[PDB]
Amino acid sequence: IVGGYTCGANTVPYQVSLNSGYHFCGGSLINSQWVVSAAHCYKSGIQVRLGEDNINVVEGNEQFISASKSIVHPSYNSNTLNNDIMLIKLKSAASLNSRVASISLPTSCASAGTQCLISGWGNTKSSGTSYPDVLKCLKAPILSDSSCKSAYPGQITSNMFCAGYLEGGKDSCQGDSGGPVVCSGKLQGIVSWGSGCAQKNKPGVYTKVCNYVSWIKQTIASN
Ligand SMILES: NC(=[NH2+])c1cc2cc(-c3cccc(-c4ccccc4)c3O)[nH]c2cc1Cl
Ligand SMILES: [Ca+2]
C-alpha cells in the first residue's frame, strides 16, 4: 500500500497473508474454512496466516493453517487477468473471535463513488521496494466505468473495476495482490493489477466479486 496508514493490530480481522516461507499475497477469510484471493497468486505449498499484524513477529492471535486445496476460476486468463479469483480451502477450520472474523460477500455490486478499505503488506514505494512488517490500510473510492476504461482502454472486462486516485500517490501495489477491497462491510473487490503503483491516471484494477457470488457459493457447496 503506497500513501496509506498503519491499520492498527487486528482492526481488519478478515485479512490473511498467504505464505510460502515469505509473504507473497493477501486474501480474505469468508467463512472458517475458506479464503478468497486472486488466481494469479496461485502456487502449491501455501500456508494461510490469520490474525496477523506484524508478519515477521509472532505477537499472539496468529493461526497458521495449511491450505487443503486452491481452486483457481476455470476461466481465469493469465494474459488478461480476467476472472482473477481463487478460493482456498483450509486443512482445518480457523477459530473465529474478534481478532479473526470472516467478511460478508455482497448481495449487489457497489456504485462509483463508494468509499472502500483496501489493506495489505505490499510494497509501500511506487518507485522501489519497501515492504512493511505491519498491515497498511488505504481508503479509496470506486471510479466510474468511463474513467476506468479511459485509463486502461481495451483492458477492462465486466469482471473488473477501478478504485483509487487519478492524481497518484495513494494506491495498492505488489504484495497487496489477492487481498480485500471492502465497502460498507462487504467484500467487493480483490487486488488484481494496475500499471505501476500510485502513478497518475493509472488506478488499480480489482476483480469485481459481486459477479462471482453464485460461483463461490456453488463451488464451496460442492467441495
Ligand atoms: N493498484 C495497483 N497499481 C496494483 C499494482 C499491482 C502490482 C501487482 C503485482 C506486480 C508484480 C507481481 C504480482 C504478483 C504475481 C504473482 C504472485 C503475486 C504477485 C503482482 O500482483 N499487482 C498489483 C495490483 C494492483 Cl491493483
Ligand atoms: Ca506476527
UniProtKB/Swiss-Prot annotation:
Residues 1-221 form the Peptidase S1 domain. Ca(2+) binds at residues 52, 54, 57, 62. One of its GO terms (biological process) is proteolysis. Interacts with SERPINA1. Binds 1 Ca(2+) ion per subunit. Disulfide bonds join 7-137, 25-41, 109-210, 116-183, 148-162, 173-197. The lineage of its organism: Eukaryota, Metazoa, Chordata, Craniata, Vertebrata. It is an enzyme of class 3 (hydrolase). The active site is at 40 (charge relay system), 84 (charge relay system), 177 (charge relay system). GO terms for molecular function: endopeptidase activity; metal ion binding; serine-type endopeptidase activity; serpin family protein binding. One of its GO terms (cellular component) is extracellular space. This is Serine protease 1. The gene is PRSS1. It catalyses: Preferential cleavage: Arg-|-Xaa, Lys-|-Xaa. It is found in: Secreted, Extracellular space. Its EC number is 3.4.21.4. Its cofactor is Ca(2+). It holds the Pfam family Trypsin.
